[model samples]
Target: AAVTASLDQALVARDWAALQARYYEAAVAGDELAGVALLERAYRSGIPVVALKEHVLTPVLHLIGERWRRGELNIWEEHLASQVTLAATEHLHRQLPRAPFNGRLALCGCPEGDLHEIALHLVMEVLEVEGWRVLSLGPNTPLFSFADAVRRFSPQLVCISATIVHDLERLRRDYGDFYHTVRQHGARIVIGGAAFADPQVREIFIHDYQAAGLTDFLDYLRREFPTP
Candidate 1:
């Protein structure tokens, strides 16, 4: 918890020096997993991860998006970086968690334009490390079908991530419409992947992104959520 909070403030302020100092302690004790887990936790929300994304692979994907924004990074680089950094979570998660948690996570992406399942998969690894059972519905899932599963499984959280820009409306409606459905059944929702609503979509869907960085997001959840 201390590591997460510290990284959160440092990354939000983009304190590279602080990060380097923390890494020495983090790297030595294998607390790097804690840092990365907190990062994955935030990306699932709309919160922005700034300086870290610029330099760190998976940890600082915001920098990558910035690079893509400035034309300093391409879709290929973004995807490649996402894939490689994603591997870090896999490596870290694989090191532990021999049993699943009693809690469950339901991960989904809209079927029509959802191509960001790999990111969803990465998030699942982190959750697994915490021992949450994962129900990865994968990409292109139908709206009704998703809600049905939510009702059937009664997961602790339902996460939907999409990188394809064109499908946010249907994706939002699928989730937004079903928000009450999940809430009525007593489940929470976390949505993200700014890549979903980026201008290239030529659609009318608008959203309020947290973009606040991983640290703040984790603090918010730690305060509000029962998830450990």
Candidate 2:
């Protein structure tokens, strides 16, 4: 395909700006094949996975979300872009370089009824790449299930991801019990998402730590986890 060939040339030339622009076009068009190919080629060619996750894919998805919110894009179109990004995330996760087992473990997921999960998937993969053995509960995990998981796995940290304000409300309602349930086990908590941008909401559900974005989350992991 002409588009694929042009993207490949951009990748080979290390023209990151050009590559990202093409990716944006593909994402807007809901061209999953082209979008996935661009992501795969970039990762295989030594572009940092986090760069793709945080810088490239994240912005594109955010753009799609913005358009959908403005009623410029349909739900199916939004879902299409999300699926393409999900595929890219899965591919990049599988390609992450391995390291010696770190003792730290992490549990990550969204609260119950949160349909926005693609961002959380990126968070889980970022943790994996950072050398933590992560148990990704994915989206819409119930409060009791989270408590039971903390009891079962007993991870050092639990990272909760919620993108919307309503999910934050759900987390607020469930936090007290979940905190008590996991505290006896020694697991600390961290929260991240667009909703955390609200100071009032964050004040209510604040934990041992909270990251404003994926980059900040990774920084905390590096400090708390310090690679061997």
Candidate 3:
């Protein structure tokens, strides 16, 4: 409660430096509550607010997953930690680099109500670094709205991220909507996340979006998206 409240305060103030200092103080002290909040803030710290997944996204999930494996944390707590940490990133991209960015991409979990947005935000950061103008649609976005975004924008690329098994069915449905929308606009689709990360699982869903390796995924995306 305290941590989320403090996180909301720092984000609201857009006080990047103070947010970093406060989060760092909490990180070394072994205060995960503070660490989680800090991770959320660190995400906003960048020139033109690029995504720093190594520090923000990966570590947070690793820690939460680690503690859960160790039995020191509740499933609900781990989820809450991720939900707040990731969802807060949604507006950061739009807010930080308040300049005209050309290309566009909409990111999400699925129409169903689960917020696994960190991966989406991570992808957005990479897209921004690659010089593609990106917008984060956040999590649980409806398939209809996603298709609408494509029709309205005619973006060169659309990226989707999926993480949980429970979200699979809905994810496939949304993926279909995405690809149909892609065909509708003749836009390229880039897709991957925790769900698609598993090679074995990839065969089962056979996502229509073009998948890429994380090692050079951003570079690949840059090369793929159409330059406006």
Per-model TM-score versus the true fold:
0.54, 0.87, 0.59
lDDT of 2 by residue, 1-228 (tens): 897687778878887677768877777777878777778888888888777777787777777778889999988888888877887678667866866678888988887777788878888777777778888888878777889899899998998887765565666787788889778899888888887788877876658888767787878877876887
- Model 3 lDDT at residue 31: 54
Give candidate 1 misplaced runs (Cα > 4 Å). 1-55, 58-82, 96-102, 106-112, 168-177, 195-213
> Which regions of candidate 3 are displaced past 4 Å?
1-52, 55-57, 75-100, 103-113, 167-177, 197-215, 226-228
* Candidate numbers, best lDDT first, in rank order: 2, 3, 1
Whole-model Cα lDDT of every candidate shown, in order: 0.54, 0.79, 0.57
RMSD of 3: 7.8
Better of 2 and 3 by lDDT: 2
Tens-digit lDDT string for candidate 3 (152-192): 87876666676654655665655566566668787765667
- Please provide, for model 1 over 1-228, each residue's C-alpha lDDT reduced to its tens digit, 9 standing for 90 to 100: 786687778767756656545533333234546446544554443333332343343334554566579987557765655444555456545554444464556444434556666556655654564456778777767667767887787876676665564555565665565666677667665555656346543233222223233444345445545554
Query: What does candidate 2 score on TM?
Result: 0.87
